[PDB]
Amino acid sequence: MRQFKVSHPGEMIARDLEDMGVSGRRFAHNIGVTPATVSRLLAGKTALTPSLSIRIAAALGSTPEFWLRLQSNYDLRQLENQIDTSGIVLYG
Amino acid sequence: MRQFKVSHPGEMIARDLEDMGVSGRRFAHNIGVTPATVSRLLAGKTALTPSLSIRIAAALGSTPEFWLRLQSNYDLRQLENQIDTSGIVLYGE
Amino acid sequence: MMIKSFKHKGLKLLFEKGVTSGVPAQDVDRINDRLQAIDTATEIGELNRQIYKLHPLKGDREGYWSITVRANWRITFQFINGDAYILNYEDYH
Amino acid sequence: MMIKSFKHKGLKLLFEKGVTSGVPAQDVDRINDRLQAIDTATEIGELNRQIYKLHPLKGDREGYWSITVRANWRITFQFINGDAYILNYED
C-alpha cells in the first residue's frame, strides 16, 4: 500500500544535514540562498520549489525532479480530503 | 531524446477547452475557481498548484499527480538556463 | 513514459526538433500536447481522460493503445514494459 | 519505485502502519526518510546520493541493492524492472 508517514522534503534535508555536520547557515551559503529562506525550508514552512530543487540537487545530489516529486507527494497527501470536489462536473 | 517544446499545462488546458466548446468563464464556475485565476492559468501566467490540480482532475480527468507533473516539468525546463549552479558544491564526505 | 521510437517521421520531427513541417498544421499543438501527455504519464491510466478516449487495440496490434487527436484522428503506440514504441499518427474511418 | 514486498517485518510495519516497535527507536526518522526515497525514485540513479552510498550486491544476491542508514546498517532490496522487492534492514 502507501507509505503511512510522508515527510516534507525540507525536514528530511534537515535531518540529513545534521548527520553530515553541515549547518543551515553553511548550506544556505553553498546553494546560494538566504539563510532565512533555508531555515524556513528546513522547518518545512516553505515549499521546496523548482528553483530550489535545481540548487538543492546541485548540492545533495539526485535529480531536481526527485526533490520536486517529494514536495508534490507530500503536498497531495497534506491535501487529502481538504478539497471538496463534490461539486465539480467531470466532462464526458 | 527529450521533447523539444514543453507547454504550460494551463495553455494545454486552454486548447482542450476550445476543442470541447467550453469557455473560460464556464470552466471556472465548474471547478470552483475564480475566473480571474482561471484566465491567468489558461494564459500560462500563473502556476498549476496542488490545490488547482485536485480541482482540475475532477473535471478533465487523469490524476492530480499528472497535472502537477506537467507543471513541474515545464517549470524545470523554463528554469534550465536561468539558474547558475556553477557555483554550488556537491557535498562528498 | 519513455517514448522510444516513432513510426510517424513527422511526429519524431515535432518531438525532437520542434519542427512542424511533417504534421498537418491544424494539429501541431494538439499533437504536441498529446506527446507531452504520453511523455509525462507514469501509468497508462493517467491518459484516461475522456477527450482522449483511450482504448487498447486488438488484433495484430495487441499491446497497442490509441488516443484521439480529433474527429477521425488518432495517436497510437505500442506499450512494452512501461515504454512507448512505434508512436504514430493515423486516421480511422 | 513502487515497493512490493518486505523481508523485514519491522520495516513493513513502519512503512504501512507508521509503527516503530520493530526498528531501532533512534533510527525511525532516518529509516522512514530512506523508505520515502526508495518509494519516490523512478530510476535507480536517483538513489545515488552521497549519504546513501548506493551500491549493487554480489551476488548470490544479484539484482540486489543496498543504501546506508548509518554505521554498518543498510537497507537492501531486490530490483526487477522498476520495482523494489524483499526490503531488509541488516548489518
From Swiss-Prot, chain B:
The record marks 3-4 as: Interaction with HigB. GO terms for biological process: regulation of DNA-templated transcription. Keywords: DNA-binding, Plasmid, Toxin-antitoxin system, Transcription, Transcription regulation. The keyword DNA-binding applies. Pfam families: HTH_3. Residues 13-67 form the HTH cro/C1-type domain. SMART domains: HTH_XRE. This is Antitoxin HigA. It comes from Proteus vulgaris. The gene is higA.
UniProtKB/Swiss-Prot annotation, chain C:
It holds the Pfam family HigB-like_toxin. Its EC number is 3.1.-.-. Keywords: Endonuclease, Hydrolase, Nuclease, Plasmid, RNA-binding, Toxin-antitoxin system. Disulfide bonds: none annotated. The record marks 15, 32 as: Interaction with HigA. GO terms for molecular function: mRNA binding; ribosome binding; RNA endonuclease activity; translation repressor activity. The keyword Protein transport does not apply. PANTHER family: TOXIN HIGB-1. This is Endoribonuclease HigB. It comes from Proteus vulgaris. The gene is higB.
